[PDB]
Swiss-Prot record, chain A:
One of its GO terms (biological process) is ribosomal small subunit biogenesis. The keyword Chloroplast does not apply. GO terms for cellular component: cytosol; nucleolus; nucleoplasm; nucleus; small-subunit processome. The keyword Phosphoprotein does not apply. It is found in: Nucleus, Nucleolus. One of its GO terms (molecular function) is RNA binding. Its main location: nucleus. Signal peptide: none annotated. The gene is PNO1. The chain holds residues 73 to 247 of 252 of the full protein. Keywords: Acetylation, Nucleus, RNA-binding. This is RNA-binding protein PNO1. Expressed in liver, lung, spleen and kidney. Weakly expressed in thymus, testis and ovary. Weakly or not expressed in heart, brain, skeletal muscle, placenta, pancreas, prostate, small intestine, colon and peripheral blood leukocytes.
UniProtKB/Swiss-Prot annotation, chain B:
This is Pre-rRNA-processing protein TSR1 homolog. The gene is TSR1. It comes from Homo sapiens (Human). Signal peptide: none annotated. Required during maturation of the 40S ribosomal subunit in the nucleolus. Belongs to the TRAFAC class translation factor GTPase superfamily. Bms1-like GTPase family. TSR1 subfamily. It is found in: Nucleus, Nucleolus. It comes from the Eukaryota.
Length: 175, 19
């Protein structure tokens, strides 16, 4: 038997309650794995059974629920199950420049943009999914798309305006 | 042409003797 434990934070319990159906139904139907949610230790527990094939699905299944722990939407992690080369890379905003106080919140606002649209635009440029924590940034996609999204984000918080990075990333996506 | 609100323009910082 193979054991995977995925931790859940305190703020992720309610979206896990509201999205549990679309979490166990993809696993229990076509991945052939047993899943439960240990409330006593607060862990999503995944183990194999007698009806599992292609054991790497287990690994992807863990990454599946890991994405929903990190804040990603459900169907993106469904695409993580369906596709074969999808990865997530995370870094804090202060991991590339020392920002304090109101500067850090301004960096958060520059990543998100007004209405979220700037972040949304970068997604539609790079075919990736970007989730902002309080200070951490998580990018889900393939390797080169992760690199383009990470370069766009690192330019956005360097001080470059969202319009300039917007135009540059919308032009450089034709390669 | 007049740039719109979306265009980034920062407010300037203002700093003999009588004999």
């Amino acid at each position: 038997e193979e054991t995977r434990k995925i931790p859940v934070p305190a703020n992720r319990y309610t979206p896990l309650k509201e999205n549990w159906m679309k979490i166990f139904t993809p696993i229990v139907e076509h991945l052939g794995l047993q899943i439960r949610f240990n409330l006593k230790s607060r862990n999503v527990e995944i183990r194999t059974c007698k009806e599992t094939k292609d054991v790497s699905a287990l690994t992807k299944a863990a990454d599946f629920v890991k994405a929903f722990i990190l804040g990603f939407q459900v169907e993106d992690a469904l695409a993580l199950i369906r596709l074969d080369d999808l990865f997530l890379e995370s870094f804090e905003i202060t991991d590339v420049k020392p920002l304090k106080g109101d500067h850090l919140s301004r960096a958060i606002g520059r990543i998100a943009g007004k209405g979220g649209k700037t972040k949304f635009t970068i997604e539609n440029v790079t075919r990736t999914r970007i989730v902002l924590a309080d200070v951490k940034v998580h990018i889900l996609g393939s390797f080169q798309n992760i690199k383009m999204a990470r370069t766009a984000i690192c330019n956005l918080i360097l001080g470059n305006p969202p319009s300039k990075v917007y135009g540059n990333i919308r032009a450089v996506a034709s390669r | 042409h007049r740039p719109g609100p979306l265009k980034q323009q920062n407010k300037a910082h203002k700093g003999l003797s009588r004999v």
